[PDB]
Design a protein around this ligand. Structure first.
Ligand SMILES: Brc1nc2nn[nH]c2c(Br)c1Br
Length: 334
């Protein structure tokens, strides 16, 4: 039988109509600068693919962020570099300032523009109802741009959103997992963080598209308005689907499985069970009532869908009543 093919409802062929140089990142030539132009000041943290430092550009004494890339295939380094240059100057996208290599260790490193970020473990506890709508609108500006540019982030989560709350600025960072969308291509489902993986990654459906980012965004919105971090708290990839199925119900899950003829892992046979689709009022209590509204629930409900085709696009999300007040204040400032 095999899975049913799928295509994105928006920006399906944008990369096809580009010159081959735009998406053929393997043939991209990189001009490696000298890392001596930067002096590391502080370690801002580290992850599985890189360790991040705050550095100073000794030529003009401006703050930058140096991200020393951990050993991955050069093909994947050019991918992140090509994507960052294609998205350069876009709304709420991090700005790649330079590409350098250590003269001694010869290790590649990326240099980004500095951001004054407050970690969401201290910031999301302080966000008002308006702040969530405002910053979600900013993330949506970034997602709509890169999707329109044929690029698919595949790792949307609070750790990858730097917010300057004093200046109300926001930047979407960490594009090491981003990929170009091409209709018909089957991608690796081993992407994104566990708590933000879309159902298509959990049931191993490889022909996904930009809508994968919209599920991750719905997981962020759910945790912010309900004050439950994370919202789907699974112990592994298989239990992650059971946590989703206990909220969105199992009826729409098996309809999704049947629609795309997805071969379900036999491990899911005994753990999914049968669950109803819970109304969002079960997650509202005295601590989060000021962040929940009929608009927030209607908007959240339209993001968290099994069928990736039925999720809102980034532009459709920006047109939701949930953002009406943010759009108006933006207009007068204009
Ligand atoms: Br500010 C800032 N903080 C980070 N923490 N991890 N990666 C980071 C990046 Br890229 C920037 Br820019």
């Amino acid at each position: 039988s095999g899975p049913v093919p799928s295509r994105a409802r928006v920006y399906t062929d944008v990369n096809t109509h580009r010159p081959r140089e735009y998406w053929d990142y393997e043939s991209h030539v990189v001009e490696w600068g000298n890392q001596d132009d930067y002096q590391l000041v502080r370690k801002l943290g580290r992850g599985k693919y890189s360790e991040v430092f705050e550095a100073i550009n000794i030529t003009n004494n401006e703050k930058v962020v140096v991200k020393i890339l951990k050993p991955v295939k050069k093909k994947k380094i050019k991918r992140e570099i090509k994507i960052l240059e294609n998205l350069r100057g876009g709304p709420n996208i991090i700005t790649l300032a330079d590409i350098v290599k250590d003269p001694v260790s010869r290790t590649p490193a990326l240099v980004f523009e500095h951001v004054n970020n407050t970690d969401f473990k201290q910031l999301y506890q302080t966000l008002t109802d308006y702040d969530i709508r405002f910053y979600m609108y900013e993330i949506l500006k970034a997602l709509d741009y890169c999707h329109s540019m044929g690029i698919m982030h595949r790792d949307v989560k609070p750790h990858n959103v730097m917010i300057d709350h004093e200046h109300r600025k926001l930047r979407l960072i960490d594009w090491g997992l981003a990929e170009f969308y091409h209709p018909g291509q089957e991608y690796n489902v081993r992407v994104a963080s566990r708590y933000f993986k879309g159902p298509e990654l959990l049931v191993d459906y490889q022909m996904y598209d930009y809508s994968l980012d919209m599920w991750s965004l719905g997981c962020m919105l759910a945790s912010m308005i309900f004050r439950k971090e994370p919202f789907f708290h699974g112990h592994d990839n298989y239990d992650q689907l059971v946590r989703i199925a206990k909220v969105l119900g199992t009826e729409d899950l098996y309809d999704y499985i049947d629609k795309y003829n997805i071969e379900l892992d036999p491990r899911f046979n005994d753990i999914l069970g049968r669950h109803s689709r819970k109304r969002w009022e079960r997650f509202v209590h005295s601590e989060n009532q000021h962040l929940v509204s009929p608009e927030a629930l209607d908007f959240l409900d339209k993001l968290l869908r099994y069928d990736h085709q039925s999720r809102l696009t980034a532009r459709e999300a920006m047109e939701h009543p949930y953002f009406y007040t943010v759009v108006k204040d933006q207009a007068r400032m204009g």
